[PDB]
Design a protein around this ligand. Structure first.
Ligand code: MG
Ligand code: MG
Lengths: 504, 67, 150, 230
RNA sequence: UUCAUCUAGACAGCCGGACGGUGGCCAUGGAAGUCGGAAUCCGCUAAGGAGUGUGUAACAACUCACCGGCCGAAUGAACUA
RNA sequence: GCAGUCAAGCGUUAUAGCGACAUUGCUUUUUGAUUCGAUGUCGGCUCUUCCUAUCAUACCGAAGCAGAAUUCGGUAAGCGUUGGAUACCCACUAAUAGGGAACGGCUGGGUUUAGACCGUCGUGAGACAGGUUAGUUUUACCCUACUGAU
């Protein structure tokens, strides 16, 4: 094993020398600061003088008292413009490095954060067997973290109980490889789209198949999306959109188990379909185009976006986490009535959708031309930004659950972090020695997990922009990874025919 | 000329840890070269892993794949 | 301006170009060498084979490269017309493939002449010459589609 | 003339009056002409003609088989489909090479009376930081044109060949003297850099050095080919 | 040498038929079997490909895949020496 | 070259093993950009003939071959294939093709012995990793062959 060079004799003498102590001064003068929001740029109080030894919690309470919301405070983070975040106190964060003097003002930008915290996963809970072939897709239940669905190449899916790390149900309806699995946003039905151009619906509690399979596609299913709960009328079940290799997006109403619309504008294989929160659908396909359809206009193609020089491999939405989670939260609370479920889903969607004046739903498309494009398809037809820097194709892309960051996993053994609003480049996550297949965020937007061809997972801290923990254990390539809604478990699977569950 | 069967031929000869990779990656870039220092011996390192530089632009897409 | 580009010599495909160059080497260079001759004579024989084949490939590639117009350097009207007719991207990519193949052939020729300087037997010199010609042939066979397009 | 002027001329004036009959008669004579060429062509042209005839017949039989087959009638993820690509060594015994073949006698002096210098005729690996010794003390000579730094290493799993740098010469089967001189012949065990292969151990360590065995004669073919020992 | 065809018709030749839904769907300035991409079905037949090639800007026209009429006795293919 | 794939065959009643034609990966990536150790035999002058694996000249075939020009190919050795500068350039030219009878008479570099100097090594006599300069071998009237002559 190759080791870093040892310290020299002079360095050992310097180590044996006594150390300085970073203590807070007592005669520290008052500092003038100006509050400003990151999303809106609104100034609170103008220039206010605070003690130089102000702590982050006391500054948060001061901001809450300025806003008039001390009764129900919301935890925020602070940054200062080179932008430096506030770790412990103002003196150590800014004054101790000496970048800003006491006489000069300090412009503090505040950004809301999550009340809860997710601890990083540091070990494997279990390595569960059962599948006969390579594992292709995995997903967690939205309501609970104890249910995981995994579809593999042995023409089967499996429902695993995450509390005991044991298999619970086996789904054996399909005839060919189960390419994609998905859970309903209300947690009622699991949809499996397979290699044999079919889709099957399953009740997970009984582990049973609901009627016959959905048929009509001529080639294998590529992606599945569900209608958002906040758009579904109460008392109704969400519809299922499916993309496939044949170039068509089919919409299925599961109440009558029929097909309503068959969008057919693409001339090549549709890579992915996503059902947004404003009654629109976005499809990325191998004909270098992204098609924007309207569900309210008989499935007509509203727009065609053409800016890529190769296949668009993946797309993501700003509110994608909210659309996937539906009405549930990180605490696993279940609404009593469909009306309450619809209202809670609407609030969860709006908290990400409507901000900084007008409600916007940004989209990001990652393609085989080594690049990504950031769009705002509602207001404009041109792309808002172009993200470049990857030396190989960008296989996966994901918005943060708060919609403030974009993470792109490419085939050049790298991940890249970009701003979620204007698409400016932030940082590079390095450490994988093979191509990164896919990525996943944590619930509080502070941790990231990625699976790679080098048989390893990696957990990264977004704030410090560095690797947190490397997770080996898989015997071969890891194809699918997911993080639970409560941020307690991580599931992974690949060519070793084993489901790896990881916990803190 | 014969080679005897041995399990030493099939073992790993050189490995590097993630912490060592990060240390050398951060050190490569912070070096301040002195004109009066000469290179007496080069350290043996996986330079293909350690030499990763952020690039502002990506190369052009290969058009022969699609057309 | 040139205004006309008819005087471009015929571009043979990959297999036909290989036949032309290799059979030109076999015809125009001496073919009888004996194992009882001096090692210097044997080395010179096989060096001449490698160098002549490399020169033939290089001059064919140069005749291709000089003949075709420069799409960016012509008048913008002609540039737009040729872009509409022949897809300027494919045009430049094919010509760059020709240029890169020329460079690779030159490098193979130089390297194998240098290696043939240290041959110890007729068998070894023959193997080195066959290796040089086979690598040149692989380089040329990789140009099947750009040559037909051109 | 401009554009497709010959096709326009054929459209507006036709062809020669005996064109169709002459072409039909030539295509009818083609079988006799092929047989006469096969029986008359001599030497290299005859050999090439026979080779091309064999290739054409094989292609025709494959086409007929494909038509008849047509008339009779890895478990990859979504993002990877529609995309394409004992402890015994593979060469436990190789041909022995004597010192007479390995070394070449170099003579020095005006009358060439001294014969103590020896030149290595095979390809060598000299490592990093190599400086030639002074000529008065240089007995063993490794010429620069025969020095190698990289090799084409083939991985048995996944079936890929990569151009990898050479790290060390572990064992030359002929002699430990050749091992310490760095001679690269067939059957030699070398150490190669495998950083680009992305191998990770069970403990999370990145593998960047492994062993390979040379499978060819670089002095014969101008390059080093090796198989990775996995 | 082994498979096949054959006076309820052997190989060549000549003549006739070679249809209808239909200009099948998408695409194209135009594309009707014959620039392309995926289906490649049904009916009536003795038989007739959602077409083997020539040909048209597209059609048209010819052709052969196949069937029939005349002719009347052996013939074809693959291997071996 | 190495490693692999397919299968017309070969082998067999144990879907073992050989295996033509094809094909992939490395060498080698995309916008026509921008000299690296020959350890021992080389070159001229004059002049003849031979090979064809044909550069030119003669006659043909094919090609988006309009004309002009050019490319590939066929028969073909009758006839030619240069002048210079220091292996590469310049020019003329129809063209400046390759090779054998040595490399299984004059003449320069080389086997150059005795003189001399510089460098490296050696305690030295001396040797060489080497570099420079100066340095006598002189038939024919014999037989045949060839050219002419009785
Ligand atoms: Mg000839
Ligand atoms: Mg002397």
């Amino acid at each position: 094993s190759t080791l870093i060079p040892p310290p020299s004799k002079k360095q050992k003498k310097e180590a044996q020398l006594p150390r300085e102590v970073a203590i807070i001064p007592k005669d520290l003068p008052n500092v003038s600061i100006k509050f400003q929001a990151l999303d809106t740029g609104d100034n609170v109080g103008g220039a206010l003088r605070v003690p130089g030894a102000i702590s982050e919690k006391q500054l948060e309470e001061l901001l809450n008292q300025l806003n008039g919301t001390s009764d129900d405070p919301v935890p925020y983070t602070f940054s200062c413009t080179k932008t430096i975040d506030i770790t412990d106190n103002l003196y150590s964060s800014l004054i101790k490095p000496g970048y800003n003097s006491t006489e000069d003002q300090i412009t503090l930008l505040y950004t809301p954060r999550a009340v809860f915290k997710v601890k990083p996963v540091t070990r494997s809970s279990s390595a569960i067997a059962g599948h006969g072939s390579t594992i292709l897709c995995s997903a967690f239940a939205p309501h609970t973290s104890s249910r995981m669905v995994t579809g593999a190449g042995d023409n089967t899916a499996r429902i695993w109980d995450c509390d005991t790390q044991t298999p619970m149900h086996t789904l054996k309806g399909h005839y060919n490889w189960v390419l994609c699995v998905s859970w309903s946003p209300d947690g009622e039905v699991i949809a499996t789209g397979s290699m044999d151009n079919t889709i099957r619906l399953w009740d997970p509690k009984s582990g049973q198949c609901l009627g016959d399979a959905l048929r009509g596609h001529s080639k294998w299913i590529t992606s599945l999306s569900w209608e958002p709960i906040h758009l579904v009328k109460p008392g109704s079940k969400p519809r299922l959109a499916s993309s496939s290799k044949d170039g068509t997006i089919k919409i299925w109403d599961t109440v009558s188990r029929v097909c309503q619309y068959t969008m057919s504008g693409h001339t090549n294989s549709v890579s992915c379909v996503k059902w947004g929160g404003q009654g629109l659908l976005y499809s990325g396909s191998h004909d270098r185009t992204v098609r924007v359809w309207d569900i309210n206009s008989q499935g007509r193609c509203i727009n065609i976006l053409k800016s890529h020089a190769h296949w668009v491999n993946h797309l993501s939405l700003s509110t994608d986490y909210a659309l996937r989670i539906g009405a549930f939260d990180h605490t696993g609370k279940k609404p009593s009535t469909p009306e309450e479920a619809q209202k809670k889903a609407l609030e969860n969607y709006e908290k990400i959708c409507k901000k900084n004046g007008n409600s916007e739903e940004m989209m990001v498309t990652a393609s085989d031309d080594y690049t990504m494009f950031l769009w705002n398809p509602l207001k404009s037809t041109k792309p808002i930004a172009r993200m470049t820097g990857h030396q190989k194709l960008v296989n996966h892309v994901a918005f943060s659950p708060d919609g403030r960051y974009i993470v792109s996993a490419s085939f050049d053994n790298s991940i890249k972090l970009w701003d979620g609003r204007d698409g400016k480049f932030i940082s590079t996550f390095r450490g994988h020695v093979a191509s990164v297949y896919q990525v996943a965020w944590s619930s509080d937007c502070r941790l990231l997990v990625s699976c790679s061809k080098d048989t390893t997972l990696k957990v990264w801290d977004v704030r410090t922009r560095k690797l947190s923990v490397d997770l080996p254990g898989h015997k071969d390539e890891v194809y699918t990874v997911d993080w639970s809604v409560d941020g307690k478990r991580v599931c992974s699977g690949g060519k070793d025919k084993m489901v790896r569950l990881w916990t803190h | 000329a014969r080679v005897q069967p041995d399990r030493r031929w099939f073992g790993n000869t050189r490995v590097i840890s993630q912490d060592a990779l990060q240390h050398f990656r951060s050190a490569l870039g912070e070096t301040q070269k002195d004109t009066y220092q000469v290179l007496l011996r080069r350290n043996k390192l996986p330079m293909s892993l350690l030499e990763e530089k952020d690039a502002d632009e990506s190369p052009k897409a290969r058009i022969l794949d699609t057309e | 301006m040139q205004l006309s580009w008819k005087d471009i010599p015929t571009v043979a495909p990959a297999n036909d170009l290989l036949d032309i160059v290799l059979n030109r080497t076999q015809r125009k260079t001496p073919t009888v060498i004996r194992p009882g001759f001096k090692i210097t004579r044997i080395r010179a024989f096989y060096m001449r084979k490698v160098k002549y084949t490399g020169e033939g490939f290089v001059e064919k590639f140069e005749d291709i490269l000089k003949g075709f117009p420069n799409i960016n350097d012509v008048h913008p009207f002609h540039r737009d017309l040729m872009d509409t007719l022949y897809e300027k991207n494919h045009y430049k990519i094919s010509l760059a493939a020709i240029s890169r193949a020329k460079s690779l052939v030159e490098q193979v020729a130089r390297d194998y002449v240098r290696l043939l300087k240290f041959g110890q037997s007729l068998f070894q010199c023959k193997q080195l010459k066959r290796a040089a010609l086979g690598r040149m042939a692989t380089i040329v066979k990789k140009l099947r589609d750009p040559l037909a397009y051109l | 003339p401009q554009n497709d002027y010959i096709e326009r001329h054929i459209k507006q004036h036709g062809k020669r009056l005996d064109h169709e009959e002459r072409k039909r008669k030539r295509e009818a004579r083609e079988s006799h002409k092929i047989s006469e060429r096969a029986q008359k062509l001599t030497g290299w042209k005859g050999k090439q003609f026979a080779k091309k005839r064999y290739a054409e017949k094989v292609s025709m039989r494959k086409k007929i088989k494909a038509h008849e087959q047509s008339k009779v009638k890895d478990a990859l993820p979504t993002y990877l489909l529609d995309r394409e690509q004992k402890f015994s060594v593979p060469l436990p015994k190789v041909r022995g090479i004597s010192e007479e073949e390995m070394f070449k006698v170099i003579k020095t002096g005006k009358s060439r009376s001294k014969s103590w210098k020896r030149m290595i005729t095979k390809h060598t690996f000299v490592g990093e930081g190599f400086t030639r010794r002074p000529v008065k003390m240089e007995r063993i000579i490794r010429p620069s044109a025969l020095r190698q730094k990289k090799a084409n290493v083939t991985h048995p799993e996944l079936g890929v060949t990569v151009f990898l740098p050479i790290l060390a010469v572990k064992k030359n089967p002929q002699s430990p003297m050749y091992t310490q001189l760095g001679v690269l012949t067939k059957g030699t065990i070398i150490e190669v850099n495998v950083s680009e292969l992305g191998m990770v151990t069970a403990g999370g360590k990145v593998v960047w050095g492994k062993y390979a065995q040379v499978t060819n004669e670089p002095d014969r073919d101008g390059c080093v080919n090796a198989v990775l020992l996995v």
